[PDB]
Paper text:
Here we report the three-dimensional structure of [name] in open and closed conformation, at a global resolution of 3.8 and 3.6 Å, respectively, determined using single-particle cryo-electron microscopy. The initial data collection, comprised of 20,080 micrographs, revealed severe preferential orientation, resulting in poor map reconstructions. We therefore tilted the grids to 30° and 35° to increase the number of views visualised in the electron micrographs. This significantly improved the number of views, and the resulting map was drastically improved with continuous density and minimal anisotropic features. 3D classification revealed two distinct conformations of [name] i.e., open and closed, indicating intrinsic conformational heterogeneity of the dataset. Two conformations of [name] could be easily identified in 3D classification, spanning from fully closed to fully open with an overall motion of ~22° between the two domains. The evident stability of the α/β hydrolase domain observed in both open and closed conformations, as well as in those from aligned cryo-EM maps, suggests possible regions that are exposed to the immune system when the enzyme is secreted in the blood, and therefore likely to include potential epitopes. Our data show that [name] clearly fluctuates between open and closed states independently from the presence of the substrate, confirming that the observed open and closed conformations occur in solution and are observed without the usage of any additive. Taken together, our HDX-MS data corroborate with the existence of the [name] open and closed conformations that could be resolved in cryo-EM, and with the presence of intermediate conformations that arise from the switching of selected helices and loops at different rates.
Numbering used by the authors: 1 to 697
Write the structure that this text describes.
């Protein structure tokens, strides 16, 4: 039977919130440094290993398989700068990608340009952002250490290939924007105090500002550019115009996709940098949508906006007079990407969760379609004055294709640059398909199903995945672990585009936000049940999984119909809605989650609260949560807090309940290859063990 679970401490503390007393027997989970939390972590992982030793040999086996399936050169898009082509590349097992600088597109011997590999001994360092100078003799990159979101900016000059002594500290969400050959604009957070480990505190983000630092001088001469006293809680970012005359600042309230944008002039006087504060024209100052900037032509200013257009729309707004005129009206599709070069505008549309590429000149805005194989655009490089464009397109079948193009006439210039081919894999062994199934709304929802052609039955192992949050659509994308699942385990993968995502744009998220948030979970239920009525899945042979908010989905749907699932995993997921507003950047999450002060919002929040909604005496599936000690993007405590209830809530019925907390790890952005590979291997061994899906030889 199930072994004796670790003796969890029970805390008497109970707090009253909106005239409702919530007890909390695990408050000591706030501080990771407490002895109780550390001993509980150690015991939980010891029992995890004891459970897993039953099929540790299969663990090693599929570890070997995933390692052999991960070994391929991952080449990204080329960048054309100063007659040299810089593109990311990996040997396949090296911890981080390294830049390649080639003299030509067809060059055989490109040299290394940027190498994060030797930065840290364990390779924990991850490159986060980069930016270019207009004279192509300067670039500024920004990385992070120990998986902590707190970053560090370094600067390098191309020709000498040497570092510089300038470094910056405690920076988050870095947006470098250089101005001619003098300096660059960035954002910086208030100075931290104490001896706490970097990125190892729960303090909420506040009192940050954007500023500008010039080269040749220390950080001490940095002059504050913009800081808002009226709204301390908002986030904001800066951007330099390619016309080299104006600076654009964008302000978001929380994480919800509305912003107000301010345009300012720039003085050519060197002393003016630090002489007087810069004025700000009130271009848009009310939250009507996300008014992203694309490019400007003199007085004219082109933006992709959601105002008066739920599916995104390209509009030209003159800032010297204040008139607004629409130039590219919204089609029935949703804009995934857009850019403006010379006279043409090239737009990638996420139509039916498929990117179709269109180009339209300023004369006739007819979006003319340029052929491109089915897939999903991941990265996109573009420069207004340049004549070379490139993008990587990948999906479930395609492991990645770097494709370049000429803006002047794509009619005969679309060419293949590189392919991320993986040995021992064939396209014909698998096939994907779209499906439409009706939810309670009476409106069809799309879903993707990828499966190996041939043997597929209702009892075959099923994995179902869907994120659906923050207006990020779960577009098709390759995964080595997914391919190991597909080919080595003979199962079928399915991806849900649930309501509330950007899969249909702003209206979809608007319908799936705040008061109707619970609605999305109901949809997920139908998803799995539909796969059982179509003949693709059986309740004893299904597993669903997701990350962060998607991980949320899993646990919360387990509260609705636990017996409708059998295998469930959580991964750095938000679970403690009662206190999610307090710690980390969760305050921005309120803009998508309901502000807990508002009573009508706390009604639904307490309705679906997965930390407390779990009930005893009812069967539950086996949850496996994964966390890391240095998790600042999401506070790790919430996840363990979830397990904290189950330990006492189900003595020997349901589960089993696994918590894998890995020492010295990240969040998911910049994970070292060894650690992420080991974690994926363990996750898939667990889902195979609790599904009984033998080796598909």
């Amino acid at each position: 039977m199930r072994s004796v679970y670790p003796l969890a401490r029970r805390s008497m503390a109970a707090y009253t919130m909106h005239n409702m007393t919530v007890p909390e027997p695990y408050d000591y989970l706030e501080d990771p440094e407490n002895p109780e939390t550390k001993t509980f972590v150690n015991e939980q992982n010891a029992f995890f290993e004891e459970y897993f030793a039953s099929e540790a040999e299969l663990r090693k086996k599929i570890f070997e398989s995933i390692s052999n399936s991960q070994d391929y050169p991952r080449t990204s898009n080329p960048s054309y700068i100063n007659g040299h082509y810089y593109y990311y590349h990996n040997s396949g097992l090296q911890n981080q990608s390294v830049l390649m600088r080639a003299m030509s597109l067809t060059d055989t011997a490109p040299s290394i340009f940027l190498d994060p590999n030797s930065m840290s001994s364990d390779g924990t360092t991850a490159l986060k952002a980069t930016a270019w100078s207009e004279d192509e003799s300067m670039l500024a990159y920004s990385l992070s250490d120990k998986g902590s979101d707190w970053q560090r900016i370094h600067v390098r000059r191309a020709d000498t290939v040497e570092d510089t002594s300038d470094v910056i500290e405690w920076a988050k969400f870095t947006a470098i924007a250089w101005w001619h050959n003098l300096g660059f604009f960035y954002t910086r957070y208030p100075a931290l105090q104490g001896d706490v480990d970097k990125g190892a505190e729960t303090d909420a983000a506040q009192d940050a500002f954007i500023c500008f630092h010039r080269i040749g001088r220390p950080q001490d001469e940095d002059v504050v550019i913009l800081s808002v006293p009226e709204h301390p809680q908002w986030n904001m970012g800066a951007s330099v115009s390619d016309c080299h005359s104006y600076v654009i600042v964008v302000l978001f309230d929380g994480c919800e996709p509305h912003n107000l944008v301010w345009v300012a002039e720039l003085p050519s006087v060197e002393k003016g940098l630090g002489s007087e504060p810069l004025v700000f024209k009130k271009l848009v100052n009310e939250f009507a949508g996300r008014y992203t900037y694309l490019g400007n032509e003199g007085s004219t200013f082109y933006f992709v906006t959601t105002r008066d257009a739920p599916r995104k729309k390209i509009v030209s707004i003159d800032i010297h007079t204040g008139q607004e005129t629409v130039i590219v009206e919204q089609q029935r599709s949703v804009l995934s990407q857009a850019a403006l070069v010379k006279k043409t505008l090239l737009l990638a549309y996420l139509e039916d969760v498929k990117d179709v590429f269109y180009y339209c000149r300023l004369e006739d805005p007819t979006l003319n379609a340029i052929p491109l194989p089915i897939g999903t655009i991941t990265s996109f490089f573009s420069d207004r004055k340049k004549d070379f464009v490139s993008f990587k397109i990948t999906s479930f079948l395609l492991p990645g294709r770097s494709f370049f193009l000429d803006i002047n006439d794509p009619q005969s210039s679309l060419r293949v640059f590189k392919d991320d081919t993986v040995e021992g894999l064939l396209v014909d062994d698998f096939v994907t398909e779209q499906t439409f199934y009706n939810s309670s709304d009476g409106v069809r929802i799309p879903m993707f199903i990828v499966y190996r052609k041939g043997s597929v039955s209702s009892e075959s192992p099923l994995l179902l995945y869907g994120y659906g949050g923050f207006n990020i659509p779960l577009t098709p994308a390759f995964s080595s672990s997914r391919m190991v699942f597909l080919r080595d385990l003979g199962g079928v993968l399915a991806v849900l585009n649930i309501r509330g995502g950007g899969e249909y744009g702003e209206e979809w998220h608007d319908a799936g936000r705040r008061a109707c948030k619970q609605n999305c979970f109901t949809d997920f239920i139908e998803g799995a049940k539909f796969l059982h009525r179509q003949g693709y899945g059986s309740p004893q042979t299904t597993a669903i999984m997701g990350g962060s908010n998607g991980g949320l989905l899993v646990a919360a749907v387990a509260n609705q119909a636990p017996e409708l699932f059998r295998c469930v995993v959580c991964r750095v997921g938000v679970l403690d809605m009662y206190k999610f507003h307090k710690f980390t950047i969760g305050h921005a999450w309120k803009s998508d989650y309901g502000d807990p002060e508002k009573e009508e919002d706390f009604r639904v929040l307490q309705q679906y609260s997965p930390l407390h909604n779990i009930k005893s005496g009812i069967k539950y599936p086996a949850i496996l949560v994964v966390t890391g000690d240095h998790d600042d993007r999401v506070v790790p405590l919430h996840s363990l807090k979830y397990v904290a209830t189950l330990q006492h809530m189900n003595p020997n019925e349901g589960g089993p309940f696994l918590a894998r907390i890995e020492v010295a790890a990240g969040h998911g952005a910049g994970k070292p290859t060894s650690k992420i590979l080991r974690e994926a291997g363990d996750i898939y061994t667990f889902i195979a063990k609790n599904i009984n899906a033998s080796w598909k030889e």
